[PDB]
Amino acid sequence: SRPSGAERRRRRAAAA
RNA sequence: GGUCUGGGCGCACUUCGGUGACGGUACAGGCC
């Protein structure tokens, strides 16, 4: 969309 | 940052939708 900033916090939170 | 968001930016991917724990949680907001 770009990724929704919250969606950046979800990137690392998919993993950690 | 407990954590979620929002929508771009300055960059790289790609079906051009979204994917990217990159500058960077930085910006401004929710129960902090």
Side-chain angles (χ1 to χ4, degrees):
Chain A
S1 294
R2 279 308 89 72
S4 322
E7 188 142 37
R8 303 177 46 112
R9 257 56 53 191
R10 298 187 272 197
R11 299 317 186 166
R12 61 110 296 178

